[PDB]
Design a protein around this ligand. Sequence first.
Ligand code: SF4
Lengths: 105, 182, 165, 201, 95, 315
Amino acid sequence: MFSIIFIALLILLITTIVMFLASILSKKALIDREKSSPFECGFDPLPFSLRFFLITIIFLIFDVEIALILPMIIIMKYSNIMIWTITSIIFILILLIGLYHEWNQ
Amino acid sequence: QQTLPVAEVAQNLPKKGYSPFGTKQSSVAEWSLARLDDLLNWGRKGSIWPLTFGLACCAVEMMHIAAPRYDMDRYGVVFRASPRQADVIIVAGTLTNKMAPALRKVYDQMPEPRWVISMGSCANGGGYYHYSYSVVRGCDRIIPVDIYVPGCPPTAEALMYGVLQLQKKVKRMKTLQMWYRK
Amino acid sequence: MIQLMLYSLIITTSIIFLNMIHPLALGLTLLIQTIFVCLLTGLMTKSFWYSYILFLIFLGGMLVLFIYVTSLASNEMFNLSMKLTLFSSLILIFMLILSFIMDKTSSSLFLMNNDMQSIINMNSYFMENSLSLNKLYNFPTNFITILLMNYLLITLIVIVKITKL
Amino acid sequence: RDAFPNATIIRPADIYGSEDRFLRYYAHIWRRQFRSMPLWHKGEKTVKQPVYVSDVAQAIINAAKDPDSAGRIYQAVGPKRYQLSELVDWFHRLMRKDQKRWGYMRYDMRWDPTFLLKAKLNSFICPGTPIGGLHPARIEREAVTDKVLTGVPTLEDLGVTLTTMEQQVPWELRPYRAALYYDTPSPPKCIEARDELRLFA
Amino acid sequence: MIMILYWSLPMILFILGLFCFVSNRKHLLSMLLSLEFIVLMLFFMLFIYLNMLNYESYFSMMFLTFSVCEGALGLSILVSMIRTHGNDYFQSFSI
Amino acid sequence: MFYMEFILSLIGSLLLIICVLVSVAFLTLLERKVLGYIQIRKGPNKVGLMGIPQPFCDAIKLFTKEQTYPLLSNYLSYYISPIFSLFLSLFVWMCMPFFVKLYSFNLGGLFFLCCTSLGVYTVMVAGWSSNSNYALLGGLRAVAQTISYEVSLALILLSFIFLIGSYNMIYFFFYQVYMWFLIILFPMALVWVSISLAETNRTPFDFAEGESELVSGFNVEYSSGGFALIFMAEYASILFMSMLFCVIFLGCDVFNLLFYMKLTFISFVFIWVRGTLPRFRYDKLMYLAWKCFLSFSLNYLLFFIGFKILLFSLL
Ligand code: SF4
């Protein structure tokens, strides 16, 4: 993992050096009032959305749920088979029943 | 004009070469800046990205250089919708009085170097609505124009001839030599 | 040594987290703190499973809600100060040279890694991330993870009711 | 004037506007030093009378059209005198730098050799124009106060109405404003003749 | 001693995050972000505890599930005042 | 600990980064060329010889143009998105299955899910700091589709990990010594193509970063080097998805030249679906990511739970 830190810091250093040299190599012109303006098509110029927030919340709940589906590949050769099967079938079946119930309602 | 050279005369003429400056520079620093400017102009003329600015009928011919017969993509030319990512704006259509601040703002948000192609008689000189109450008399009063393509709907060979003339202008750009002489 | 570097980075990001006030900037400080916390909890452990779990759950899974809410909360940009950057760099170089002049054997953690264990340890040779995750899927502790999945579904039911949709 | 005898000499004091070397030079990051602007004698000693670029362009045209301006020196200065400290504080009030979380501080330039070392290194390493115009000639120009000469004509003799500073400058410094921290500006005080004589005593 | 050299830093940063949680110079979003900062420090200290034991590190995703549900609960409490208190309630320095 | 391991790991990682970047440039050339041949028209030509240095013409132009900003006062947050985007696109390649050892990633799928979970973060800072309503809309739409198929991608790769029995990417090689996984996982092949064109913004999932409904989603204010780094990061994501399709479904075959021929073929397939399909909608893409692909993921995960239990009794 210590080599991963060194190579990630080297990628970050190389990208910042490339962008700094690109900013030096960029052609410096006179800065303007209208050039700095945010682009709206043509003529010059959002509230909170709850639907996207519950999309993020559904993503979070399913992400923490996936983080419990993640370990059981390793445990299948090192656990009780009946307990592992009962928990896996119950886990994915309650997930499917909840998904279908939230679809129907 | 000049008479184009007869082949008896032109066989005695040497080859022009790629560089408009020539390789006969005196100083080694001047020669190095000349070749760096040649490489920079080759990179700039090797890919100009025009902006999707189609105001009126001329733009129906503008898509006809996108079309498979003429094929602008093998000239470095590919359309970009955002004005930041684009090099060129092709004024292809009729600039009106309500269209003037939109065109000026879109041109001002474009980053420099900025070459402008006026496509069609409404773009340069006003054209067929030159005496109208709500048509700007050419776009040269608002946006500074480098290439002016003449035809009312320019054929697409003539628009691409304007594109090649813009590429010859970009190849003739002198920046580092001017910096050495500034 | 690199554990002390992560100590210094967490101290520096925590004091700049205390200093700043812009909400997306605190969100950025949290997302760059979570990486160092993940690595530093990876230094004590046998294998990097729980650092990955904390990574997907906290940073990529949960804090994107915080980044979205703090992005739509603040209209303005960051006011970057070179004074705070210089102070953070000065305390960072001071704490790295303090870790240079300090014995790293006494400052290392007593928690055993996978290679810090005994060679005659039978359980370490079997399978990476096997015996630690075993009690999740065995009797009688499987009822907790069944209750956890039910808890996450019930959490979603709570969240739909309280936001009123 | 030795070569061309009938040559009109307009003498601008310091010209402000958009894309200038005055407001952009006092608006740049490279001019400041850790959110604090160094000024010579804290900006209190020097009194400057800046002029707009449209006013001096109208003065150039009014000298070109009217042929009584042959060989006459025209002092191109603004309507009112201001000292540099009040000008810089008014500029930072316009850019919303007056908030307490920004940490605006005005201090003496002669105590800070690091700023002059930075200006010399900026004049060294830049191949083209230096960034922000922080050459030492601009430093000595901001050190020199604007002195008008009596008996020598001013642009009001050329028939141009000089634009006041408070009308034009907030429009120039409107895009230069900082982002507001998550936690109208006052106009600056002009310096009269007797107050300038008291300050220079 | 053992407390001074080992696990002293999560205590200090936990008290710093607690003081950022309750200071009157901050706002509600800063309270929630400092709350997840002390969640991260709690994970750090809990993992230092759980790694004295060999194979009980599986509890780390239980506390993670509960505290992440707490964080989503706090965000959904805080954004439920958008349609009632307006969009300016995030800058409130007092409750 | 032996220092030539560190030296050769550093040399191999830097050589991988350099070859990935030049392959990104030639992938932009390949996409502009054969994407033209999707229609009747020709690809790039007339620059250099037969259009080969056209991406270098792009690189000289994009590194010279004026670095414009969405606002004039404070724009350091505008810089940090292409840096982290190219950093993640060059950092995700460290979990490639190398048979000669470069990094012993025993958990490579989790590393891939981590870098994909930062993809939402770099596109969110891309959207917000560009100060435009089009930029915020494109950033929110890209974050929406990428977290919508993040859960689906995690479940699909989680179903694939049940086949090899571990999280080690090189274990895809030993279970493909007799046949490829394209035979056994062909609906998973179509679903994985729909996944890999969703995390990386391509034409079938292009409501995030299209030129029709928005002018550009989050590259609208990015130009003159930042757009170059973003473009290189996105094409490196395309190259990574082509490699990851070629490891899981097609046999890993890391040494053989046929593996890299198949990687170029899956890049050709990515440009082939670039020219064919239209673009989905927001409502239909929420229908696709959370109902159809999620139901298929959980169902066929149940199928491999039953199959891995059935083979465990027989073996
Ligand atoms: S110049 Fe002619 S073809 Fe073009 S917009 Fe005008 S009328 Fe139409």
